[PDB]
Design a protein around this ligand. Structure first.
Ligand SMILES: Cc1cc2nc3c(=O)[nH]c(=O)nc-3n(C[C@H](O)[C@H](O)[C@H](O)COP(=O)(O)OP(=O)(O)OC[C@H]3O[C@@H](n4cnc5c(N)ncnc54)[C@H](O)[C@@H]3O)c2cc1C
Ligand SMILES: Cc1cc2nc3c(=O)[nH]c(=O)nc-3n(C[C@H](O)[C@H](O)[C@H](O)COP(=O)(O)OP(=O)(O)OC[C@H]3O[C@@H](n4cnc5c(N)ncnc54)[C@H](O)[C@@H]3O)c2cc1C
Ligand SMILES: Cc1ncc(C[n+]2c([C@@](C)(O)OO)sc(CCOP(=O)(O)OP(=O)(O)O)c2C)c(N)n1
Ligand SMILES: Cc1ncc(C[n+]2c([C@@](C)(O)OO)sc(CCOP(=O)(O)OP(=O)(O)O)c2C)c(N)n1
Ligand SMILES: Cc1ncc(C[n+]2c([C@@](C)(O)OO)sc(CCOP(=O)(O)OP(=O)(O)O)c2C)c(N)n1
Ligand SMILES: COc1nc(C)nc(NC(=O)NS(=O)(=O)c2ccccc2OCCCl)n1
Ligand SMILES: COc1nc(C)nc(NC(=O)NS(=O)(=O)c2ccccc2OCCCl)n1
Ligand SMILES: [Mg+2]
Ligand SMILES: [Mg+2]
Ligand SMILES: [Mg+2]
Ligand SMILES: [Mg+2]
Ligand SMILES: [Mg+2]
Ligand SMILES: [Mg+2]
Lengths: 582, 582, 287
């Protein structure tokens, strides 16, 4: 039973109605940066005792923190910005949340309703700008609609395939006095009538049947399984099917497990891509068959019966055409299939030990490998040490690039929502603000931003946020002085011709530039640099043991390449397994 | 006669066709940040000997630098980004350039044409996203269209009312070999047939007539006059009409001039707003009657005959309905009116000394004023000292907020394009990257970013750009530890209730946070802090005399208020002339 | 009701549009491709494994043929009034099921679908998804131009026929042998049927005749045809219908046959919108 701060017959500002609408959704944290068009909302936030605001230093930091909050908790992330330049600073995070299916509610202040369309001060038609990069958006045109629209926004953001919803609120609506009606029904008849139903036994029986008739089955799990950790684990016990995971699915099935093929795709392991290449049954659970994973679509799982379980009917058959399809929640499909598998256990007699042994041969012939040069620090090794010293229990956020791939390859995530990374859009600058949101959502967890030097500097201003909010955010900065992933493609395909990928100072070519330690010092954050591989273990331990925030500048040789690599649009026969920039 | 690097019958990549298309437009500087979808463009840039790339550390820094380049030179600014997260990082600058009518050409890499619409890796429908925040945009669907589309983009960006044009280039088009045709005609028949014609003598005679019949004429000049400095000056000689300027028009008529009423509007001088309030003839040259200037439209110049000269027919009568209107280039209208005024000089006998004397009485009763408290540094005083020590010849860029207003009020810009400030959108974080672009465009000029602590930290990452490019950018950081302009509105209208406007560390409340000197140190930029008003003059002099970049952290009491202030939607009778946060 | 449609069936959906597969009903097996090629491939497999598969559904076919004899398509003959269903059966007989048939939209459209045995595709030209009245006459024009040696008959309703009646001039000028079988019930019949079933027969602007001369056929469609030099006739007695249709077919060039029908006819059977098979209506009319 909710307790309002206003009498049921007492008129309050629309901004107070909006804040209470957030309170009634269970919101405890927002990421709000004030401006003229949203001042009323910020005043109403100070009047709330249950909602805390984390003031970022850039609205892109605000939306990315809301993402990290959401990705690490399963709850919707809430960011708030003013009109115009505040709203446009949210755009990268909105697109990021849509491509990765992250539940997000973004609220933007807007000019007064009568000023809309007149090129008013700090006016941006943000509803038009963001229509194609949000799951849905709204322009509130009356204070009476605030309870309903906020409720619909949270429902749309969190139900079905999750995504971002933007709510544009004109300033005059924030000031207008009204008595809210919290009993209004939502106006989503089409959306609600097309929400997937529980999976029928008809479809679930056929899948278990295809499993018993197959000899080379491969699980292909992705971001849709983040809430099915227990069900997927039980499913693997009952079937013994090896698990290949996408970038977004990492941790749904434990990485340090015997049946784990780890990541597949462009930078997936040789044995995971091998398994899919030669499988006869592909169980595609919570995946969208993106080009990083499949390469050439015609060659992807070319001799496999493809079972695709997805909550979005539009994804089924979008790129790869399945044989069997189930449109529904993969959590429920796993539960139904687990019952059938448990009952018919002695009848089915499932044993894929011959297939698993064929894969474990590839696993030992072509494992993930890295080279140690003198006393230089291998980035892959630094992440393995972090995994060891944190016991694989840390929440990991990343930027985008080589360090992102190494953070995916060389850390054994035991649970979903430890892995917070921008996969579909791949937005640099995500790692630091995402760690802010993850730490606020999980204040007792070890939170480490494994960042690159290009990605880290893009939103370096959020170090001030970390200090002011006294968040124990650790930064493991893999510093190669380059835009590494673009540098790698220069080496492979452009004869190592450098086109603006060096991030240091060419006048002092052998100096680490910039000095990231002084960025941390500017914000009162203790920091250190490590260069010798012998010193790396104690340096990471110091970062972990030092209470509060900490930045560890880990210098790495830039000639490292992420391996293996299947070229874009290629097949398994095109996989690159050796070579670097030396 | 242009000299290509390829034979007229030699096929080259579309990326090379695009770079040569830029060369044929006279482009010498681009602001390009590489990514997968634009690697080909970056490779082709290294093959150009006439185009230099300034690598920013954030694409928002790239687009804002392109703006500063354009605003300070009259040439179009060119920024380039990769697909997806690179493109979305341009959005604030695109909207900023549209609202301020800044000529800009933005090029974005895109996924291959066949991948468009499939939720491909790093795909954003940027043409759809930016349609409402650009003057025009394109999606190139064939390599043959590159010469024509690039030519149309530069023509549209720079002709008529200037604005940003975005060109989206799929990666496969960049790789396709072709022989360009540089003789293709542009496909803009509607736009070119509606381009304003030279002003007819019919309309110009009527204006000169209205001038001779008026007794209280006021010039109301804005961003449309940036290329009419000489003509406007000659016009003021022949008429003796006092000049009130918008934020965007500052410097079109010299500020340190006898007839200068300085800025009008919400934070305009009392005498400028007085002149417009009681004028009988309002010469509105290159302005758009925005709400910051007019307040309540019905009360703005309520007893004046309004002459509006604008190159955009859609602006004439959009908010304020004029009596006489001329749709054309104000440069040509001034030239035509100057001829008529010079010929009929002895016949017209123009003398407004009675009106000028009535205004100079208001100018002495209500001048711009600031208060000095002990040894604390008044921000207004710091800008006056900078004006003196630079002899009013510096290019000034700003962030957004109180410091922006003080930079407009207390610096006497002698020429247009010394003032680079985000007026319509009002985007924080503009000042530092805009100074980068202005310095690259004007390498022998004094370039000073008068920034606020909130605005400066948003794009602080561009300090690395400044050092690496060895640009002599000076930063005059007016540090009040607050989001000052929002703080001022909290004081006036919300009983000084703070809603997330303090930017320091509440744990160490009396410590300057963050330490901006260490941000500069991180990027090898010499810096200093000044707190005592007695030390300010030598500190600014040191900043100016020290070669290369320099950051001066100027600590200011946060209780300062920008005055005067006409409340939003108010009239001249509502002007606030006294008070602060004390 | 989608949940009740083929509720106990394994659904195989072959469609050339990937967006249709799983749009409303979720299939078990799906093939995105040309159904022509899928049939060719399946026919090879079926022909090779013929003796191996031993397909026989005679038990299922017999269960259906029991329903086919218990609940066939039925219509009632009242005195000498012309049943519209009967008129279409006679047209089927006299044309040997080889005519190209276009229709308007409404009851006559349903009866043209139910009571004509089309032997080949592209004999049936009818607006199904949008269901646009006025389609029948101009569609017959295009079909006749494309198939100048075929028998082309527009089975039209009086509301639908008058919407694009101006194309009679096109038919004459182009000398197209378009036959019009006008099932004239003086009403917007399909909307009238829903008025009878669900609104207690309360008429809301469905009568197309002249209320001043209520028992007169209005308008006189024969004079529309006469205005464009198209021979025409009206038939009212069921005994005269067979010769009238034969005259329409034998008369070279265009011809309009105004077939007067009792308006109280209902299209049967009828499953109400959003209903299930258990809701099928098998009897009743507007009497
Ligand atoms: C530099 C870089 C390199 C990359 N290389 C790789 C790589 O080598 N390998 C790799 O895997 N990725 C890689 N990616 C990541 C990549 O581009 C995609 O983000 C990722 O492959 C897609 O993850 P997914 O297939 O699990 O789909 P997601 O983006 O996670 O979407 C989830 C899918 O499941 C469905 N779903 C959601 N909820 C449910 C539910 N409750 N029940 C059923 N279904 C549900 C959704 O409708 C959607 O179809 C890379 C990214 C970057 C930036
Ligand atoms: C915090 C803040 C406070 C502000 N307060 C004030 C204030 O007190 N006072 C103030 O003036 N501004 C203020 N502004 C700035 C403001 O919001 C607008 O940007 C500014 O007032 C509009 O300038 P303008 O009228 O010259 O039109 P512009 O934006 O400069 O547009 C130019 C106009 O001239 C026309 N034009 C362009 N070229 C030509 C040509 N060759 N010939 C003829 N016409 C041409 C264009 O079509 C357009 O109509 C403030 C901004 C901020 C961020
Ligand atoms: C907002 C944004 N701008 C540009 C991007 C284009 N990309 C990349 C890519 C793979 O998406 O190529 O398409 S990765 C990358 C360089 C990463 O520099 P680092 O942080 O130092 O990490 P590392 O360990 O050295 O590799 C760029 C420039 C991007 N994704 N986001
Ligand atoms: C991207 C962005 N986000 C938020 C903004 C909303 N605003 C402002 C305003 C007037 O536009 O209010 O609408 S000004 C301002 C605070 C300026 O902090 P400072 O840089 O330290 O300068 P100062 O000398 O102290 O005043 C905010 C938060 C904005 N315009 N841009
Ligand atoms: C352009 C147009 N306007 C109105 C229509 C709405 N409908 C119908 C329906 C089923 O689509 O109802 O939705 S059918 C119909 C009446 C048909 O009159 P008839 O031609 O005489 O044939 P009959 O043998 O008597 O039934 C109407 C008014 C329509 N479809 N098209
Ligand atoms: C420097 O000007 C300033 N500063 C601050 C800190 N706040 C405000 N607020 C304000 O102008 N409110 S408004 O009357 O409704 C309004 C009217 C017209 C157009 C826009 C608009 O607001 C939306 C954007 Cl501010 N203005
Ligand atoms: C880590 O992956 C990576 N890294 C780097 C540095 N570059 C590339 N390039 C690349 O994938 N080119 S592409 O085949 O045409 C292509 C195909 C499909 C979708 C997009 C797409 O490109 C556009 C965005 Cl990269 N990929
Ligand atoms: Mg080792
Ligand atoms: Mg790097
Ligand atoms: Mg003084
Ligand atoms: Mg400030
Ligand atoms: Mg009979
Ligand atoms: Mg009818």
């Amino acid at each position: 039973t909710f307790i309002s701060r206003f009498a049921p017959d007492q008129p309050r500002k629309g901004a107070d109605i909006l804040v209470e609408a957030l309170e009634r959704q269970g919101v405890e944290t927002v990421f709000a940066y004030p401006g003229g068009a949203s001042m009323e909302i910020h005043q109403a936030l100070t009047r709330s005792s249950s909602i805390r605001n984390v003031l970022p230093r850039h609205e892109q930091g605000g939306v990315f923190a809301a993402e990290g909050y959401a990705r690490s908790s399963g709850k919707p992330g809430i960011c708030i910005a003013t009109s115009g330049p505040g709203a446009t600073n949210l755009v990268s995070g909105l697109a990021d949340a849509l491509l990765d299916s992250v539940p997000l509610v973004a609220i933007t202040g807007q000019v007064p309703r009568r000023m809309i369309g007149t090129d008013a001060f700090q006016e941006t038609p943000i509803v038009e700008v963001t229509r194609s990069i949000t799951k849905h958006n709204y322009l509130v045109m009356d204070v009476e609609d605030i309870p309903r629209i906020i409720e619909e926004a949270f429902f749309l953001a969190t139900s079905g395939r999750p995504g971002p919803v933007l709510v544009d609120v004109p300033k005059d609506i924030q000031q207008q006095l009204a008595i809210p009606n919290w009993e209004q029904a939502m106006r989503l008849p089409g959306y609600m009538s097309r929400m997937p139903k529980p999976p029928e036994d008809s479809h679930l029986e056929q899948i278990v049947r295809l499993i018993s008739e197959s000899k080379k089955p491969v699980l292909y799990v992705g971001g849709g399984c983040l809430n099915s950790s227990d069900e997927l684990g039980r499913f693997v016990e009952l079937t013994g099917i090896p698990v290949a995971s996408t970038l977004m699915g990492l941790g749904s099935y434990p990485c340090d497990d015997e049946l784990s093929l780890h990541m597949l795709g462009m930078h997936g392991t040789v044995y995971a891509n091998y398994a899919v290449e030669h499988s006869d049954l592909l169980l595609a659970f919570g995946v969208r068959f993106d080009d990083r994973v499949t390469g050439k679509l015609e060659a992807f799982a070319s001799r496999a019966k493809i079972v695709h379980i997805d909550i979005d009917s539009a994804e089924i058959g979008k790129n790869k055409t399945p044989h069997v399809s189930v449109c529904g929640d993969v959590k429920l499909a796993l539960q139904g299939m687990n019952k059938v598998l448990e009952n018919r256990a002695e009848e089915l007699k499932l044993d894929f030990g011959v297939w698993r042994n064929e894969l474990n041969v590839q696993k030992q012939k072509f494992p993930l490998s890295f080279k140690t040069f003198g006393e230089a620090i291998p980035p892959q090794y630094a992440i393995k040490v972090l995994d060891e010293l944190t016991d694989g229990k840390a929440i990991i956020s990343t930027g985008v690039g080589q360090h992102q791939m190494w953070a995916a390859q060389f850390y054994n995530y035991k649970k979903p929502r430890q892995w917070l990374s921008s996969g579909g859009l791949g937005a640099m600058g995500f790692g630091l603000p995402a760690a802010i949101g993850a730490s606020v959502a999980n204040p007792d967890a070890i939170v480490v931003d494994i960042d690159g030097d290009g990605s880290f500097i893009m939103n370096v201003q959020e170090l001030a946020t970390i200090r002011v909010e006294n968040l124990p955010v650790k930064v493991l900065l893999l510093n190669n002085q380059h835009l590494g992933m673009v540098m790698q493609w220069e080496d492979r395909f452009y004869k190592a011709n450098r086109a603006h990928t060096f991030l240091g100072d060419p006048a002092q070519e052998d100096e680490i530039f910039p000095n990231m330690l002084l960025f941390a010092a500017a914000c009162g954050i203790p920091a250190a640099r490590v260069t010798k591989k012998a010193d790396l273990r104690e340096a990471i331990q110091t970062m972990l043991d030092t209470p509060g925030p900490y930045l560890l500048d880990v210098i790495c040789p830039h000639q490292e390449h992420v391996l293996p690599m299947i070229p874009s649009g290629g097949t398994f026969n095109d996989v690159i397994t050796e070579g670097d920039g030396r």
